[PDB]
Amino acid sequence: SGFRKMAFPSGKVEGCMVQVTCGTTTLNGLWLDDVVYCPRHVICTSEDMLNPNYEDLLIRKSNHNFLVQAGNVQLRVIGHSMQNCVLKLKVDTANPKTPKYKFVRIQPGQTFSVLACYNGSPSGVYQCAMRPNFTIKGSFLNGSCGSVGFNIDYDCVSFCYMHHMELPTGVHAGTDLEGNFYGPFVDRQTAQAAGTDTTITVNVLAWLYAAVINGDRWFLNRFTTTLNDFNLVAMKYNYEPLTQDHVDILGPLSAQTGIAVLDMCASLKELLQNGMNGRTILGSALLEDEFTPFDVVRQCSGVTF
């Protein structure tokens, strides 16, 4: 019993974290095989960030300008190239702790674990979701750039995020491991703002199924609804639309609990129009949307890595 916000075991990723220094800027790099990936803004000073020409800045750099440190060992940079907003530093040594890995781009609503690092040293691990406005509500201080988000599938690490910046509202923005930003963000010192966030509906339903599996049933009702009537109500409360794919993905939890997805949507519809009325669900007074249906199945069934 119990339900916790749970991250993947971070060990396979800790063995990849390195410190990357370029001039006065120090941030984190991800060392996989003989390449170190890091945000390209490491090559920028305070003025450069205002309006940077990264191709122009990178051409002026030499391999010896990048100081890569893996533990107490300095790695020697033998090449440098840029892929979108990520810098790739070729090193002479392949990381012996390189796990089986893939670079994957995730969709909004998908969750991942963040290994927050400072000076190439892992300091914490937390579970979060890619918000529908493409930001992440992370916990990051100065020096956390280059920290990565990942999932684990069997024995393979799927790297899905690299931290680049913090928006004025305290939310965070970054890229996939190919340097493509999630969201309409740029890696510049300019006025940027996240769009109005919405609730990840399929995740709320998955979390309501986890609450039922844990014995919390007060919100269940006799009612069902159509996907169309639910979506009309949900859109009014700034909830993301629920697609037939989402209904299908919730199938196993629906079968395990005996509550159909449209039956659970009728519970969710009431929860929105009436509130919790002093009650909680899994110790929470708000509907939690950072657990995907797969996260719920993994936790409520004990999948190991």
Next chain:
Amino acid sequence: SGFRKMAFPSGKVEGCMVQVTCGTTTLNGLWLDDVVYCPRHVICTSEDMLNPNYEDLLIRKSNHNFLVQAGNVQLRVIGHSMQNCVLKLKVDTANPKTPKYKFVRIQPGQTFSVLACYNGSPSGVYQCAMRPNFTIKGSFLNGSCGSVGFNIDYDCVSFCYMHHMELPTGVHAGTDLEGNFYGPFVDRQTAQAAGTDTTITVNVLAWLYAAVINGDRWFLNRFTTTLNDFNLVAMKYNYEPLTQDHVDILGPLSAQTGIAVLDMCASLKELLQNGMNGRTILGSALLEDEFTPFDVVRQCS
């Protein structure tokens, strides 16, 4: 900016997780140097579980009855001994991935990371507090016994918890790494119940300071309170009493934010009286008590 429930990186502990099998029972062990630590209830035949005599059961066991598996390698048990509710299986191989470590017993209110495991394989990592009633509100299934709680403050792993059992209310009980249970619990199937839980007041105050550091100020008020008046109100909401030690520990956050501890205590009294009125503090509609003053300073700097 931002505030998250954050666990320590679990790598140093993953390299220590092994599977321990004794008869039909399989659970997790912690492999440090040439010793594997695990709950002593692994030697019980479920029929012994109501009133087990563990000294009697352990004396009947031989080293070849314990099957220890580290990854795909079977370790050879060359000795067995018991320290309180923990079984120590001496193995013929020192764990090469043994980190710098210590065994620490924690107090209620303290937080730690849990590496939940099944069959010696880590499946997830999360953050807990030792509740004032000495239970932990974990997420554990059958087979999670032997999963450990830890803190990793600078290079060294401090092991503070080993999971032993789930109480009838879904909460969890376990021991320190010396086998001493936290709380009035025993490793028997006898009727056991956790005491009524209370809120860790010092942690709520620390979290209110984290919210102020993050720009949340709506709950602040012009009032202050005596420590005794605060405890009288707090006890009525099933909040733990706040001692002078707790006031002292909140000193650095008080200095950083410019809000005296008793000034923040008056905000907390108002929050308990009115509720949040549709507002959230750090994205939460409830007062969070699983961040210690030390966690807040470490996370916020």
